[PDB]
Amino acid sequence: SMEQVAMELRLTELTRLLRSVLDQLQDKDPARIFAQPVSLKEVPDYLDHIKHPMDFATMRKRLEAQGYKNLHEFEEDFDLIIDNCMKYNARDTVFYRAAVRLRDQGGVVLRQARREVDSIG
């Protein structure tokens, strides 16, 4: 149907916007602490601590399959990256600190993304 196509164009355009959001958030992680999944070879107990691991590469795979239906779903995954790290790692660590700085800097980007998603529809 023509409606299904229109919906698909909306999803494509959301994907375009979330791709730009993802690039902007990942620039706020210049150390690449959050770039890839925590290695279960190197942290074998990880899944005992963290039930829903997340990282920027995993989000990008979902994004490119157009697997984010709305901004809320995308923000959920970004919040998992931060929150997982802040639980597994102690306050005094470069990992925790990196997550705090990514949360604070990402807030700005996400605030305007929300306006753009509502604005453009």
Curated annotation (Swiss-Prot):
There is a cross-link at K41 (Glycyl lysine isopeptide (Lys-Gly) (interchain with G-Cter in SUMO2)). Highly expressed in testis. Residues 9-113 form the Bromo domain. It is found in: Nucleus; Chromosome. It comes from the Eukaryota. Component of some HBO1 complex composed of KAT7/HBO1, MEAF6, ING4 and BRD1/BRPF2. Component of the MOZ/MORF complex composed at least of ING5, KAT6A, KAT6B, MEAF6 and one of BRPF1, BRD1/BRPF2 and BRPF3. Interacts (via PHD-type zinc finger domain) with unmodified histone H3. Interacts (via PWWP domain) with dimethylated and trimethylated 'Lys-79' on histone H3. Scaffold subunit of various histone acetyltransferase (HAT) complexes, such as the MOZ/MORF and HBO1 complexes, that acts as a regulator of hematopoiesis. Plays a key role in HBO1 complex by directing KAT7/HBO1 specificity towards histone H3 'Lys-14' acetylation (H3K14ac), thereby promoting erythroid differentiation. This is Bromodomain-containing protein 1. It comes from Homo sapiens. The gene is BRD1. The chain holds residues 555 to 674 of 1058 of the full protein.
